Design an enzyme around this catalytic site. Structure first.
Site, PDB file in Angstrom:
ATOM      1  N   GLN A   3     -56.952  31.063 -17.335  1.00 37.16           N
ATOM      2  CA  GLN A   3     -57.131  32.450 -16.947  1.00 37.16           C
ATOM      3  C   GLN A   3     -58.495  32.604 -16.289  1.00 37.16           C
ATOM      4  O   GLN A   3     -58.593  32.530 -15.063  1.00 37.16           O
ATOM      5  CB  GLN A   3     -56.974  33.343 -18.164  1.00 37.16           C
ATOM      6  CG  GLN A   3     -56.953  34.817 -17.852  1.00 37.16           C
ATOM      7  CD  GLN A   3     -56.672  35.648 -19.105  1.00 37.16           C
ATOM      8  OE1 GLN A   3     -55.530  36.003 -19.374  1.00 37.16           O
ATOM      9  NE2 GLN A   3     -57.719  35.960 -19.866  1.00 37.16           N
ATOM     10  N   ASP A   4     -59.556  32.760 -17.080  1.00 38.73           N
ATOM     11  CA  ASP A   4     -60.903  32.870 -16.535  1.00 38.73           C
ATOM     12  C   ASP A   4     -61.733  31.616 -16.859  1.00 38.73           C
ATOM     13  O   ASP A   4     -61.436  30.894 -17.819  1.00 38.73           O
ATOM     14  CB  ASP A   4     -61.591  34.139 -17.082  1.00 38.73           C
ATOM     15  CG  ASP A   4     -60.801  35.422 -16.764  1.00 38.73           C
ATOM     16  OD1 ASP A   4     -60.211  36.038 -17.689  1.00 38.73           O
ATOM     17  OD2 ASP A   4     -60.740  35.800 -15.570  1.00 38.73           O
ATOM     18  N   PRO A   5     -62.754  31.301 -16.055  1.00 38.38           N
ATOM     19  CA  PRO A   5     -63.619  30.164 -16.389  1.00 38.38           C
ATOM     20  C   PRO A   5     -64.408  30.462 -17.657  1.00 38.38           C
ATOM     21  O   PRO A   5     -64.587  31.622 -18.045  1.00 38.38           O
ATOM     22  CB  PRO A   5     -64.552  30.025 -15.178  1.00 38.38           C
ATOM     23  CG  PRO A   5     -64.023  30.977 -14.114  1.00 38.38           C
ATOM     24  CD  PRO A   5     -63.219  32.020 -14.851  1.00 38.38           C
ATOM     25  N   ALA A  34     -58.440  33.077 -12.122  1.00 37.57           N
ATOM     26  CA  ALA A  34     -59.684  33.685 -11.668  1.00 37.57           C
ATOM     27  C   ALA A  34     -60.695  32.564 -11.462  1.00 37.57           C
ATOM     28  O   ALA A  34     -61.146  31.940 -12.428  1.00 37.57           O
ATOM     29  CB  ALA A  34     -60.213  34.707 -12.672  1.00 37.57           C
ATOM     30  N   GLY A  73     -64.437  37.029 -18.062  1.00 31.76           N
ATOM     31  CA  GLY A  73     -63.358  37.628 -17.283  1.00 31.76           C
ATOM     32  C   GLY A  73     -63.723  38.801 -16.393  1.00 31.76           C
ATOM     33  O   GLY A  73     -62.901  39.690 -16.206  1.00 31.76           O
TER      34      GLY A  73
END
EC number: 3.2.2.-
Length: 276
Positions: A96-98, A163, A172
């Site tokens: 999803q997000d780093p 993302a 996020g």
């Protein structure tokens, strides 16, 4: 100036990548210059022709104008694509997000790959749970002491985050920023290649994998490996003519990598060695 191991096999104690404000002192963000693998230029030529793309480079430039510490650093932004030309992708694993975190020294955990972190960083709990799953289904006998997934990615595991960026120590915060780019990346792969394996861990990745034709491609779905969901089933919206929430098994109960193995073997494709 570098070879592939210098980007993908990263040592936090020997970390010389420039930050965003160093690569673009005057905030002139140019994403094309961060893509070192020529087999992607065609995809990139398609993406720059879209109307959202100048908006994307505008938003990133505005983050640099406010001096936000975007992670991962730009030479790592497209890391998985710089390792893997699209024709060599066998498995797509969406994050999803780093990771927003960093070492004591300011080395970010984010390295442009989903789930992976540089050598000599702590193993994140999600990744530890992935290792636990590999051990449980006999793909691995002992968890590696590091969290660097260079080995899987070099063998065709396309591990990206939907993302591509966040801000250091903030989780996020760029979730809308990359949605059209990631949608065009998924669509590019499913339109030009066949019989890929999509692994959907969690509801967000599952939504994204419903862009993919499930008769043309193989989609494996479970809950996310993070400790908050690893041993629970997941409920996720199944889109279509009659949309409805469906229940999918818990991460730790599915043999994800056994399923990848069997599908590759059933199409006579070269296997992935998870342990090495």
């Amino acid at each position: 100036n570098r070879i592939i191991t210098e980007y993908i096999l990263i040592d936090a104690n020997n970390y010389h990548f420039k930050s965003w404000i160093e690569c673009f002192p005057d905030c002139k963000v140019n994403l094309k210059l961060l893509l070192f693998r020529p087999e992607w230029f065609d995809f990139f030529k398609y993406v720059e022709s879209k109307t959202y793309f100048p908006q994307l480079e505008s938003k990133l430039s505005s983050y640099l104008e406010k001096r936000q510490r975007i992670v991962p650093y730009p030479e790592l932004l497209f890391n998985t694509m710089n390792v893997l030309p699209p024709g060599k992708i066998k498995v797509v694993i969406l994050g999803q997000d780093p990771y927003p975190g960093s070492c004591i020294s300011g080395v970010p955990y984010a390295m442009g790959c989903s789930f992976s972190v540089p050598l000599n960083c702590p193993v994140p709990k999600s990744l530890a749970n992935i290792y636990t799953n590999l051990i449980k289904f006999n793909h691995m006998r002992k968890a590696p002491k590091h969290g660097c997934l260079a080995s899987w990615i070099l063998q065709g595991t396309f591990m990206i985050n939907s993302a591509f960026t966040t801000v250091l120590n903030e989780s996020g915060v760029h979730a809308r920023t990359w949605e059209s780019f990631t949608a065009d990346l998924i669509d590019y792969l499913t339109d030009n290649y066949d019989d890929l394996i999509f692994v959907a861990w969690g509801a967000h990745a599952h939504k994204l994998c419903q862009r993919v034709d499930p008769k043309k491609h193989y989609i494996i779905t479970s809950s996310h490996p993070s400790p908050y969901s690893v041993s629970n089933t997941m409920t996720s919206m199944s889109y279509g003519p009659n949309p409805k929430k469906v229940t999918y098994p818990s991460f730790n109960s599915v043999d994800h990598f056994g399923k990848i193995n069997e599908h590759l073997k059933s199409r006579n494709k070269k296997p992935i060695f998870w342990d090495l």
